[PDB]
């Protein structure tokens, strides 16, 4: 079974997700999944064709579990890991505003997403974070955007140049 919308990989993860019955275990698995399968900094590209869908299914479980475990105040203001959302948001923004360059900035923004994307951090704080972190990242990235030659930009990004044609 190797379909686009339905396949063995997806089935296997649905089974794996069905066994996460406590918030801490489920939230931890979601964060681990994001480190392992999302963004260009992911640990591997093995789940490239299904990770987006699988991540959503894992999110669903963490969400329902969090709503059942947290009281109303905590559901609004705490992360799934019990951290104070505002503190995390403010702390991350602080680091972002201190970032020395666009390279440090991209790591901060991307890492923040992998770690706190809802249902880990409440949506309100998370999108407020997107608003602030994204602004700085762009301000740093878009300054003198074309000054660096591609020959050198390839080195800065750290890609392995496999083939070139002209």
């Amino acid at each position: 079974k190797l379909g686009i919308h339905s396949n063995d990989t997806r089935d296997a993860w649905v089974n794996k997700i069905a066994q996460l019955n406590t918030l801490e275990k489920a939230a931890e698995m979601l964060k681990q999944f994001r480190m392992d399968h999302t963004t260009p900094f992911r640990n591997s590209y093995e789940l490239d064709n299904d990770y987006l869908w699988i991540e959503a299914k894992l999110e669903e479980k963490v969400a329902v579990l969090k709503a059942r475990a947290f009281n109303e105040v905590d559901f609004r203001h705490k992360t799934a890991f019990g951290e104070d959302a505002k503190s995390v948001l403010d702390g991350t923004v602080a680091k972002m505003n201190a970032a020395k360059d666009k390279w440090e900035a991209e790591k901060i923004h991307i890492g923040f997403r992998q770690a706190y994307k809802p249902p880990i951090m409440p949506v309100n704080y998370f999108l407020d974070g997107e608003r602030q972190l994204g602004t700085r990242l762009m301000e740093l990235r878009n300054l003198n955007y074309y000054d660096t030659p591609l020959e050198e930009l390839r080195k800065q990004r750290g890609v392995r140049v496999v083939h070139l044609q002209s």
């Binding site: 919308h5 709503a67 809802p118 608003r131 994204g134």
Partner: protein
Amino acid sequence: SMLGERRRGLTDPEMAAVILKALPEAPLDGNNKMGYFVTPRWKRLTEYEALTVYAQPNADWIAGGLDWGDWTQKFHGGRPSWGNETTELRTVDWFKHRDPLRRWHAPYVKDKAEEWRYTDRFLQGYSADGQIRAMNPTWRDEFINRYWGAFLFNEYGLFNAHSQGAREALSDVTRVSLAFWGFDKIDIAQMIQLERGFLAKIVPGFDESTAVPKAEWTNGEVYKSARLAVEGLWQEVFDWNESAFSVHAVYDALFGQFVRREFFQRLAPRFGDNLTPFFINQAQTYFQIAKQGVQDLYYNCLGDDPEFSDYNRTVMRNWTGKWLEPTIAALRDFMGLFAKLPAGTTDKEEITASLYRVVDDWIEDYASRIDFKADRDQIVKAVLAGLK
């Protein structure tokens, strides 16, 4: 020339013959129904559904999507164009919602257009019939110009609360309903100003400037907590569903309904004002129209979701508790307006009865739908403390 220079394949003999010759003997498929694969909400697929459902290019990783793969271009940082992360609510399918009134763009502007022309005829007939003669001067210059006027900012704020939703909604049916709910709010805000502009034309000395109503809204006491709530709902909420739900199923259902229906519409007639009720009537019609959509999305689709019913109700109960307090504060401050009315206009018993009507309607139409345990007498008691 009489015939023009451009030749059309439908009428040009040479071109049409070329076209006709290339045609098949019959259609290459007998299924002439666009959107035939959409699950109909009613007996048969509606034009509303065919033209709307699945227009949004969501992939399967956003519940209900038919596409596949990641977006082609995302935000700096990685945020997806549309994603599950923009709202706390979950569902098996974001395309399940249906506006009970089945409004796509054509039917929507058609009705509002009828209302615009009807309004123009009304004002002309009202002015030509000299009905302004029967309006109490104090009610007109104090309560309509200042207090009803100030309310336009409330509706304007609620309109603006929809901006993020227009951008983040996770489906076409929800985006369209959401856009129409917001559009009707700015329309009401503009109809309040329109009334003031009308009065400026038929009443010597009546100033249509918004300076007075705006100073009341921004610095007065009657609307202080109302403004604080609006500012929060609009700019402190980043979850498009928390915004639409809290605005329509909490704040506007309680504060909005009370101000429009239980204060201005209930009292205007007692001062020879048939003008304001004309517009409030539109606002109430719009309110009831939005209610149907709000109820379908939050109660029928999300609150009753086969997989996330329990979860979504827990979240909406959370939101109701969160926004009920600021809403009660808004009503409490508004109670201060009654002390400014001419003695004998109304009394504590009428005010209390009208509060209970709004609260009971709210419990029946909204709170009960998610099992929120509202205590009607405790809510009214908290509000009545604002009576001076």
